[PDB]
Amino acid sequence: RLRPLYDKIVVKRMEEQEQKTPSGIIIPDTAKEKPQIGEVIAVGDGKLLSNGQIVSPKVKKGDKVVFNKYAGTEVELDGEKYLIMSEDEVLAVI
Amino acid sequence: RLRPLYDKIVVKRMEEQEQKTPSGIIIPDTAKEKPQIGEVIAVGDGKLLSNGQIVSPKVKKGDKVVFNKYAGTEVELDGEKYLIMSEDEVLAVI
Amino acid sequence: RLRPLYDKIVVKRMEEQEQKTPSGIIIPDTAKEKPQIGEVIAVGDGKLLSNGQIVSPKVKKGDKVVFNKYAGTEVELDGEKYLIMSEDEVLAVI
Amino acid sequence: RLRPLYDKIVVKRMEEQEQKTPSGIIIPDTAKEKPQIGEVIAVGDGKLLSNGQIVSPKVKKGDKVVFNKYAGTEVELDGEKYLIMSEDEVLAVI
Amino acid sequence: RLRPLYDKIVVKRMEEQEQKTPSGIIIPDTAKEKPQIGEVIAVGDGKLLSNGQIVSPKVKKGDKVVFNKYAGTEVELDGEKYLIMSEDEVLAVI
Amino acid sequence: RLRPLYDKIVVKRMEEQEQKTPSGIIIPDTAKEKPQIGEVIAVGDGKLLSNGQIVSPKVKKGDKVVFNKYAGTEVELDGEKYLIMSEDEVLAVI
Amino acid sequence: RLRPLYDKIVVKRMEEQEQKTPSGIIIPDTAKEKPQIGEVIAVGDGKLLSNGQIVSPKVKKGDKVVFNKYAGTEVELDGEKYLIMSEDEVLAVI
Amino acid sequence: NVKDLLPVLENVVRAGKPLLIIAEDVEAEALATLVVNHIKGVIRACAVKAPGFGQRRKDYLQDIAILTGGTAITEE
Amino acid sequence: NVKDLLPVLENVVRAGKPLLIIAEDVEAEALATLVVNHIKGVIRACAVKAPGFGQRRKDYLQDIAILTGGTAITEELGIKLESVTLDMLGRADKVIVDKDNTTIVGGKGSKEAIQARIEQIKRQILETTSDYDREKLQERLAKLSGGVAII
């Protein structure tokens, strides 16, 4: 449905997953932050270089990426919410 | 009537509706931000590259775009309000 | 009389029109806002690119240009008032 | 005496007068702004581009420029005050 | 496991060592700062130039990279944590 | 002794010689600013462009150069005092 | 040992050496600021031009370099200390 | 502000009937709109302060609202 | 401020008639305009303080605007001081200004008004007997309808 423009990407969060340590300690929701891990729904055309060339985005639909801390713009679509996210502000992939 | 210059875009927002969640809950108008969905009516000639070339805007007449939560100039035109907006701040389309 | 340099333009605002709604309600001048509609008096040579090329301004001195709320700087010429501005801060034309 | 370098321009700020309206109303010196009108006494070699090229300034010896209300350094030269100022901050000419 | 994009580098700090002076003075952990020296787990493709060219990163797998105090984003990866950082903020190597 | 790098220039200010009004009025040193006119000791290779080209400095050894009230770091050498500068903050010469 | 990257430089400051005026007046260490004179230790490859070319740094080795006070991170290393330093804030040499 | 008073003014000018305002206090840009419009005769209207204090406001306007056949515009 | 003081001066220099200003105050920047202009004789004008405080302010200048044939530029009316003109600028025949007193003879206008004010103010005088304790309300009637005598 939603398609980004130029270097923009649209990414979903990892959703609240009942966070708990591998040792079995459960952290209450009042003391955990929204996950930084997310996967791509759609990919834009890419960056606009100064000469007009369009670099192909290096992200893929099926991978997962990490946002720095507050990346995203929290777009919403018929009750579902995504964070549209910029290529140059991606920390890393998988 | 009103036409933009270079990369400027004229967008008409989604206006006021009796908002209700899919469960049927009606949100009062005092607890809602202005809609972030808009329709493109006028498209500028395109962004001015550093070397002077012109790139055709990707948005088209009648498309649905989402603003960056604050974009526009709230300009009035013939008893009506339009939102002149720029390509680098358009979030995503349809 | 006066002529601009590079991308500068000379615009004459739409003066004190004694604003009234189409429904007939008269708004006092203590409640009005300075009009954003202006008439172009002089057009400069055009934007000077980084490589020295000059692009002809898209304004043609015979059109209605709407600025942002605080665009341009006032200049006084032999008794009248003129608002000069650059080409990249006017948002729409006609 | 002074030769400006590159885009710099040295201007004399129209000197001081007691201003009177065409109707004959005189304004006291406590309510007068320093004139924005100026005449160029010398011009620099021209703006230095990113590629090293130099573009000849369009301002001449006998023109009348207008400042953007603050531009200048107010240099002193044997009791005479000049206004070294730049092209990109020149509002308009004559 | 994790891989970066473009100029990003994944770096692992020197971790806890119970800092002690060569003379034998033991400094308490409340009076020591997180080490600025780290090691590289993986490197990205390289810096993305304005013309689209890609330059190979000047850092290898086994290099010991020293960085500034706040050059990372403190990522987490299934229990271990890494320092995502770019090429322009790593001050030197070994 | 010292020599500058790239666009840096080495200048010495005209210093205080008990300045007086040309009509004979003497101004105390507690109410005067450090002189803004100075002469150059040494010049660098020149401004380093983004493309690598080096432009020869316009300022020469014997020129008298004025600066914009905050010229340089005011460094010390062998007990003598020099005020390094650069052409972008140079205002005018002689 | 310690290798700077690209345009970074490795510099050692002069360090306090019982500072005193040539006239024989001893200044206490509580009233002297850290020396601005530094010795070049290691030199990086050079600045990365926008096109991707590499320019050889103009400082070679062991030359005395003066810096604008807060021009280094004071990198921590065993024994003799260093502050890393870039070429564009280098003040002057020899 | 005019941005809210005008839409309600838009409705009454279409009907062409007199208008009465009961509000907490009107002393500003909004106030000047009615009186300059009333002088020009485009509408015949007046504005008054609401009675009571604290709790003593809302009960009074509620009694006035039901007497007039309309509804009180409450923040609730 | 100087700017808004030009349009009123622009109108009066065009007709070449003296101007009397009643306002809350005229500070140095505005006041310097008239006094400098007054010495040069381009205008002959004077400025006076407004008569009273609070509700006493509103009542006094409304009466003053009535017998002068003009109108009072109030916040309610909304006319910006820049946009004022000769049309609502009131008139009088003779005014006397001294160190602490100002007198206006009257323009003999607004006959329907002055007869009206006689009515409600007396209607107000009888109603104000519960509260008023000063002749200021009767003197308000006396000033626009008769005179005052001090023995």
Show the 3-state SS of chain I: CCCCHHHHHHHHHHHCCCEEEEECCCCHHHHHHHHHHHHHCCCCEEEEECCCCCHHHHHHHHHHHHHCCCCCCCCCCCCCHHHCCCCCCCCCCCEEECCCCEEECCCCCCHHHHHHHHHHHHHHHHHHCCCCCCCHHHHHHHHHHCCCCCC
Across the interface, whether the CB atoms of B91 and A4 are under 8 A apart is answered yes
Across the interface, whether the CB atoms of I2 and D27 are under 8 A apart is answered yes
CB contact at 8 A, B3 and C86: no
Angle between helical axes of I28-40 and I5-15 (0-180°, round to 10): 20
Residues in I touching H32 (Cβ below 8 Å) = 75-78
Give the gap in angstroms from C-alpha C6 to the nearest C-alpha of chain I.
32
**What contacts G11, CB < 8 A, 6 or more positions away?**
G38, G39, G40, G41, G65, G67, G72, G82, G83, G84, G85
Say if I32 is an interface residue toward chain D (CB within 8 Å).
yes
Across the interface, whether the CB atoms of A1 and B53 are under 8 A apart is answered no
G/H Cβ contact: 3+ pairs below 8 Å: no
Across the interface, whether the CB atoms of F22 and D79 are under 8 A apart is answered yes
Q: What beta strand segments (E) does chain D contain?
A: 3-4, 8-12, 37-43, 47-48, 54-55, 64-66, 75-77, 80-86, 92-93
- How far apart are alpha carbons I104 and I90 in whole angstroms? 12
- How far apart are alpha carbons D70 and D90 in whole angstroms? 11
Which among D94, D24, I47, C30 has a CA at the least distance from the CA of H31?
C30
- How far apart are alpha carbons H26 and H1 in whole angstroms? 10
Touching subunits of E (3+ CB pairs, under 8 Å) are: A, G
Residues in D touching F91 (Cβ below 8 Å) = 4-5, 8, 73, 75, 84
Element (H, E) at A84: strand A80-86
CB contact at 8 A, B61 and B41: yes
**What contacts C90, CB < 8 A, 6 or more positions away?**
B5, C9, C11, C59, C65, C66, C67, C68, C71
Across the interface, whether the CB atoms of B51 and C47 are under 8 A apart is answered no
Which among I35, I33, I38 has a CA at the least distance from the CA of I2?
I33
Residues in F touching D85 (Cβ below 8 Å) = none
Across the interface, whether the CB atoms of C92 and B75 are under 8 A apart is answered yes
Place of tokens 């990198």: G75
CB contact at 8 A, G85 and G10: yes
User: What are the distances in angstroms from CA C4 to CA C42, C47, C69, C84, D49?
Assistant: 7, 11, 22, 8, 21
Which among B17, B61, B8 has a CA at the least distance from the CA of B39?
B61
**What contacts B61, CB < 8 A, 6 or more positions away?**
B40, B41, B42, B43
Burial of D63 (0-12, 13-18, 19+ CB in 10 A): middle
Give the gap in angstroms from C-alpha H35 to the nearest C-alpha of chain I.
7
Across the interface, whether the CB atoms of I6 and D26 are under 8 A apart is answered no
Its sign, for the CA torsion D45, D50, D51, D52, is positive
Task: Tell which of A1, A3, A5 to mutate to test the B interface (max B CBs under 10 Å).
Answer: A5
Element (H, E) at H68: helix H55-68
- How far apart are alpha carbons D61 and D40 in whole angstroms? 5
Residues in C touching I78 (Cβ below 8 Å) = 28-31
Element (H, E) at H61: helix H55-68
Residues in C touching D94 (Cβ below 8 Å) = 1-3
Residue of I9, I33, I42 lying closest to D31 (CB–CB) = I33
Phi, psi at G65, each rounded to 5°: -125, 135
Place of tokens 């929290």: A74
- How far apart are alpha carbons D48 and D57 in whole angstroms? 11
- How far apart are alpha carbons C73 and D69 in whole angstroms? 9
Instruction: Tell me whether strands C3-4 and D92-93 are parallel, antiparallel or unpaired.
Output: antiparallel
Residues in chain B: 94
Touching subunits of H (3+ CB pairs, under 8 Å) are: C, I
Within chain A, what is the greatest distance between any pair of CA atoms?
A: 54
Element (H, E) at F59: none
Residues in E touching A90 (Cβ below 8 Å) = 5
The radius of gyration of chain A from alpha carbons, rounded to an integer in Å, stands at: 15
Both tokens assigned to H9: 């003014």
Say if I73 is an interface residue toward chain C (CB within 8 Å).
no
Give the gap in angstroms from C-alpha C31 to the nearest C-alpha of chain I.
8
F/D Cβ contact: 3+ pairs below 8 Å: yes
CB contact at 8 A, A25 and B32: no
Angle between helical axes of I111-128 and I136-145 (0-180°, round to 10): 160
Say if H35 is an interface residue toward chain I (CB within 8 Å).
yes
Which among C5, C73, F68 has a CA at the least distance from the CA of D90?
C5
Tell me, letter by letter, the H, E, C secondary structure of chain E. CCEECCCEEEEEECCCCCCECCCCCECCHHHCCCCCEEEEEEECCCEECCCCCEECCCCCCCCEEEECCCCCCCEEECCEEEEEEEHHHEEEEC
The residues that bridge with F64 in the sheet, in sequence order, are F39
The structure was resolved to a resolution in Å of 2.6
3-state SS, residue C85: strand
- How far apart are alpha carbons H29 and H44 in whole angstroms? 18
Phi, psi at I30, each rounded to 5°: -75, -45
**What contacts C13, CB < 8 A, 6 or more positions away?**
C34, C35, C37, C38, C39, C81, C83
Both tokens assigned to D57: 């300034």
**How many CB atoms are closer than 10 A to CB E91?**
23
CB contact at 8 A, F67 and F36: yes
- How far apart are alpha carbons G41 and I85 in whole angstroms? 79
Residue of G51, G58, G93 lying closest to F51 (CB–CB) = G51
Instruction: Please provide the DSSP assignment of B50-63 as one string.
Output: TTS-EE--S--TT-
